[PDB]
Design a protein around this motif. Structure first.
Motif, PDB file in Angstrom:
ATOM      1  N   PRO A  51      40.928  56.027  32.247  1.00 42.60           N
ATOM      2  CA  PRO A  51      42.077  56.365  33.105  1.00 42.60           C
ATOM      3  C   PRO A  51      42.213  55.485  34.354  1.00 42.60           C
ATOM      4  N   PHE A  52      41.516  54.353  34.398  1.00 43.23           N
ATOM      5  CA  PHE A  52      41.552  53.509  35.585  1.00 43.23           C
ATOM      6  C   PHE A  52      41.624  52.047  35.165  1.00 43.23           C
ATOM      7  N   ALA A  53      41.949  51.167  36.108  1.00 38.34           N
ATOM      8  CA  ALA A  53      42.091  49.741  35.790  1.00 38.34           C
ATOM      9  C   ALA A  53      40.786  49.132  35.290  1.00 38.34           C
ATOM     10  N   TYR A  54      40.798  48.615  34.065  1.00 33.98           N
ATOM     11  CA  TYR A  54      39.588  48.000  33.493  1.00 33.98           C
ATOM     12  C   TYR A  54      39.040  46.867  34.372  1.00 33.98           C
ATOM     13  N   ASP A  55      39.922  46.194  35.100  1.00 36.50           N
ATOM     14  CA  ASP A  55      39.514  45.066  35.933  1.00 36.50           C
ATOM     15  C   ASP A  55      38.403  45.423  36.923  1.00 36.50           C
ATOM     16  N   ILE A  56      38.321  46.682  37.362  1.00 37.49           N
ATOM     17  CA  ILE A  56      37.267  46.992  38.334  1.00 37.49           C
ATOM     18  C   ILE A  56      35.872  46.828  37.740  1.00 37.49           C
ATOM     19  N   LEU A  57      35.757  46.851  36.414  1.00 38.01           N
ATOM     20  CA  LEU A  57      34.467  46.804  35.734  1.00 38.01           C
ATOM     21  C   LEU A  57      33.983  45.397  35.408  1.00 38.01           C
ATOM     22  N   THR A  58      34.901  44.441  35.343  1.00 40.45           N
ATOM     23  CA  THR A  58      34.612  43.205  34.609  1.00 40.45           C
ATOM     24  C   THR A  58      33.513  42.318  35.187  1.00 40.45           C
ATOM     25  N   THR A  59      33.382  42.278  36.512  1.00 41.61           N
ATOM     26  CA  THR A  59      32.315  41.480  37.116  1.00 41.61           C
ATOM     27  C   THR A  59      30.942  42.114  36.971  1.00 41.61           C
ATOM     28  N   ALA A  60      30.885  43.367  36.524  1.00 41.16           N
ATOM     29  CA  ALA A  60      29.578  43.957  36.188  1.00 41.16           C
ATOM     30  C   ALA A  60      29.088  43.427  34.839  1.00 41.16           C
ATOM     31  N   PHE A  61      30.033  43.067  33.970  1.00 42.63           N
ATOM     32  CA  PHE A  61      29.712  42.501  32.659  1.00 42.63           C
ATOM     33  C   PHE A  61      29.420  41.021  32.802  1.00 42.63           C
ATOM     34  N   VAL A 134      46.667  43.057  37.532  1.00 42.57           N
ATOM     35  CA  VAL A 134      46.951  42.027  36.541  1.00 42.57           C
ATOM     36  C   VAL A 134      45.669  41.263  36.176  1.00 42.57           C
ATOM     37  N   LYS A 135      44.979  40.738  37.191  1.00 45.65           N
ATOM     38  CA  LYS A 135      43.716  40.031  36.963  1.00 45.65           C
ATOM     39  C   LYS A 135      43.014  39.789  38.307  1.00 45.65           C
ATOM     40  N   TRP A 136      41.741  39.403  38.264  1.00 47.86           N
ATOM     41  CA  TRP A 136      41.091  38.899  39.472  1.00 47.86           C
ATOM     42  C   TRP A 136      41.549  37.477  39.690  1.00 47.86           C
ATOM     43  N   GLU A 137      41.759  37.107  40.947  1.00 45.35           N
ATOM     44  CA  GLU A 137      41.927  35.688  41.264  1.00 45.35           C
ATOM     45  C   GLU A 137      40.576  34.987  41.137  1.00 45.35           C
ATOM     46  N   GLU A 161      50.718  44.079  39.584  1.00 43.14           N
ATOM     47  CA  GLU A 161      51.994  44.213  38.887  1.00 43.14           C
ATOM     48  C   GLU A 161      53.146  44.141  39.880  1.00 43.14           C
ATOM     49  N   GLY A 162      54.065  43.202  39.690  1.00 40.59           N
ATOM     50  CA  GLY A 162      55.169  43.054  40.614  1.00 40.59           C
ATOM     51  C   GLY A 162      54.850  42.392  41.948  1.00 40.59           C
ATOM     52  N   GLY A 163      53.704  41.722  42.039  1.00 38.99           N
ATOM     53  CA  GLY A 163      53.430  40.873  43.180  1.00 38.99           C
ATOM     54  C   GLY A 163      52.490  41.453  44.224  1.00 38.99           C
ATOM     55  N   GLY A 164      51.869  40.561  44.992  1.00 41.10           N
ATOM     56  CA  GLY A 164      50.938  40.961  46.025  1.00 41.10           C
ATOM     57  C   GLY A 164      49.504  41.037  45.527  1.00 41.10           C
ATOM     58  N   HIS A 165      48.589  41.340  46.441  1.00 35.98           N
ATOM     59  CA  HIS A 165      47.172  41.379  46.120  1.00 35.98           C
ATOM     60  C   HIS A 165      46.499  42.615  46.682  1.00 35.98           C
ATOM     61  N   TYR A 166      45.397  42.989  46.038  1.00 41.76           N
ATOM     62  CA  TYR A 166      44.600  44.153  46.406  1.00 41.76           C
ATOM     63  C   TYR A 166      43.194  43.622  46.630  1.00 41.76           C
ATOM     64  N   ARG A 167      42.711  43.702  47.862  1.00 35.46           N
ATOM     65  CA  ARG A 167      41.456  43.026  48.220  1.00 35.46           C
ATOM     66  C   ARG A 167      40.200  43.878  48.073  1.00 35.46           C
ATOM     67  N   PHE A 187      27.214  27.796  47.250  1.00 34.28           N
ATOM     68  CA  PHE A 187      28.420  28.478  46.784  1.00 34.28           C
ATOM     69  C   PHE A 187      28.451  28.515  45.276  1.00 34.28           C
ATOM     70  N   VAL A 188      29.072  29.549  44.722  1.00 33.99           N
ATOM     71  CA  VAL A 188      29.430  29.533  43.305  1.00 33.99           C
ATOM     72  C   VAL A 188      30.903  29.870  43.136  1.00 33.99           C
ATOM     73  N   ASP A 189      31.686  28.918  42.634  1.00 28.51           N
ATOM     74  CA  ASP A 189      33.074  29.185  42.250  1.00 28.51           C
ATOM     75  C   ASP A 189      33.066  29.960  40.946  1.00 28.51           C
ATOM     76  N   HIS A 190      33.942  30.954  40.832  1.00 27.64           N
ATOM     77  CA  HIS A 190      34.051  31.770  39.623  1.00 27.64           C
ATOM     78  C   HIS A 190      35.517  31.804  39.173  1.00 27.64           C
ATOM     79  N   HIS A 191      35.730  32.056  37.886  1.00 31.53           N
ATOM     80  CA  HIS A 191      37.037  32.504  37.389  1.00 31.53           C
ATOM     81  C   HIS A 191      36.793  33.424  36.207  1.00 31.53           C
ATOM     82  N   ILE A 192      37.073  34.713  36.386  1.00 31.90           N
ATOM     83  CA  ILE A 192      36.871  35.691  35.324  1.00 31.90           C
ATOM     84  C   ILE A 192      38.257  36.091  34.758  1.00 31.90           C
ATOM     85  N   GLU A 193      38.354  36.239  33.435  1.00 33.41           N
ATOM     86  CA  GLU A 193      39.621  36.545  32.782  1.00 33.41           C
ATOM     87  C   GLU A 193      39.447  37.419  31.553  1.00 33.41           C
TER      88      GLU A 193
END
Lengths: 217, 217, 217, 217
Positions: A51-61, A134-137, A161-167, A187-193
């Motif tokens: 019932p929640f955005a899957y994106d919150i989980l992805t960096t744990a994987f 939508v996704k992590w930046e 969804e529909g613009g803007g960011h959630y930090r 530093f480590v640059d990341h891109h998760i998708e």
């Protein structure tokens, strides 16, 4: 270097709860530790449909999957075969907060993750409970030694969804199970998708690319 | 583009207080906006010799001086001749907190800064009041639009005398004085350095190099 | 003995909110042993203020708090030499203010030199939009740290049309001479604007405050 | 009418701190109208706990709080169906815990299902080093947000050999049915371990709690 390979496998189980509602997810993947690239397929085993955005989980994987130049000490690849664990808090700007742990071990050519994930205080009308992400930046994680272990902090943002960011601010503590050489500040640059998923995210295919660097000269 | 040049000048005055003790600093510099490089000489005019680490002030002493690729909208160079202002909070891990503002205008080929800087709750035995800082590490600032203006957040760290780091989180709001085109989510790598200074930092020569980018593909 | 049942107050505050400067002067009177005080405030510069006046009012002295005999009174002991305070006020939407007050005593009149600065208040938030009604009453928690006195409080502004907007205060109090330090304790507060003109050029402000030790056992 | 002057409690908590799992069960009794309760707790798994037991104790129900007639009692109204809560506990050294409690009612016995998780407690901090003595008494601030009830509190642990270690609580309370919502109010608390064996395998815990409206006018 005897227990690592150009191509490695991954198995995981995550057990967790968000706003008090429990769930479990298992994963199977593979990656290329020296290329800093990995992917995996994840299946919700309990608590679905989430019932929640899957994106919150992805960096744990697992920072083993990051390309380290020869001039930066690699805390993660050094830590094997014994492995390492990590602890993380993820503080969202609307007061939502998640904490997670991963105990990482190695069996043959396969990393094994035992993950716990918990989240609370996500508002019912927020982007997480309403699945408006939508996704992590992409990001740049800042890593530094503290009390003989390695810290990694990162300013993360979910596009909406529909613009803007959630930090969200991440603070991770990484702990090798044996004594390893400690790195300088880097530093480590990341891109998760999420590359693909079914309608309710019962099935998700996830990719990450990561590379370490020393910042501007 | 008619009011910018490959080589530009800078004049500033900062008025401020740390833990309630007031000071003032003036600066003269020059920079290359398209190369993302700048330097300046700073003189303490009041409140000297400063009883706190000069490093806390240095990022208050303009994102015009950052190399932007053609594929990222440049909020800052667009904002001239009218200019822009910024507001910033800098929250240190031991509870020390600074806030600052800069109103930036342009006169001929010279940027003019009016800076206010205030800081409180720095512990007497902390690295700031005991002047135990060495330099800021390089960083990567994360920039995103919010409510029609531009935000920039960065995980900063001061290296300390005898090892270790002292962390600070920056949250900046940038506000153009006219309507300009807004950028997509992007990054600016920075490296700020005090190149020289006299014994009590009454005189300081300061350099910054900065370049925008889009992160990993 | 320099503390009388009826005392006077004079103050000047200089400040800026989101980079816009202002100045306010005040004249008041209070009863240190009754923990009650009132004052009349006049905007001298920067009027009409473009932000909610309520953000300022707690900057306009814990001398005006009724302490029971069984709690050490850090504040009344600090005179005639006086004390100073520093404070951060962190609002839930990222707005942040920091303030300082240097308090001295001249005859029967306390003199305050106040600096106030605030940044990152969103254009559409309750502060910039003047949607606040009043501070709720509160309970401050006070404790010694590094030989000085700390006071932390969860504050809330009630909002026009319902709901609350939260702010966390962290104050450091510093006697100018050595005084006896208190045990952990509380101060209940209630601050109110009793009257004001249309644009808050003139404001009549009251506070009632009483120290206590919380529930027993 | 399902709320009696004397009621019973049964709970099980499952949790992890810095990735190390544990389980605790409890049996107690309290007096809802007197705002007093006590209980005996036994570690079932993960013992001897390697962290300060005090971090757990507020997880071990605001039903046990004396409400005056003039303050709406969100908690007593929520039965027989019950309510749940979610809580973040942010420690000043970066340690962070989050917890949930699902509370039901069976006859005259409240049943708690509690999850507790904590991460980023420094090895040399007061939690991992067991240097805490007790929580100080406190005053919780409660207010409605999004149709549910929030409670925030500044908490402090007194430390062995003096001083305090601060923690900010943010709790969300959610009735399972629609109940009448209260105005802004306070609950004073005092929680105490009255007895325990050497490694806290057995703990006797008490709480006294009373709601109030703060200072008048």
């Amino acid at each position: 270097m005897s227990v690592i390979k150009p191509d490695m496998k991954i198995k995981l189980r995550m057990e967790g709860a968000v706003n008090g509602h429990p769930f479990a997810i298992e994963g199977v993947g593979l990656g290329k530790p020296f290329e800093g690239k990995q992917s995996m397929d994840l299946k919700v085993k309990e608590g679905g449909p989430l019932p929640f955005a899957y994106d919150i989980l992805t960096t744990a994987f697992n920072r083993v999957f990051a390309k380290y130049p020869e001039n930066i000490v690699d805390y993660f690849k050094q830590s094997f075969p014994e492995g390492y664990s990590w602890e993380r808090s993820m503080s969202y700007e609307d007061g939502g907060i998640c904490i997670a742990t991963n105990d990482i071990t190695l069996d043959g050519d396969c990393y094994i993750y035992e993950i716990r994930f918990d989240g609370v205080n996500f508002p019912a009308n927020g982007p997480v409970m309403q699945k408006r992400t939508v996704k992590w930046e992409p990001s740049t994680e800042k890593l530094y030694v503290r009390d003989g272990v390695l810290k990694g902090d990162v300013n993360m943002a979910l596009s909406l969804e529909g613009g803007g960011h959630y930090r969200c601010d991440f603070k991770t503590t990484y702990k090798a199970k044996k004594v390893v050489q400690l790195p300088d500040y880097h530093f480590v640059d990341h891109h998760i998708e999420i590359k693909s998923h079914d309608k309710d995210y019962s099935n998700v295919n996830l990719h990450e690319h990561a590379e370490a660097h020393s910042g501007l000269p």
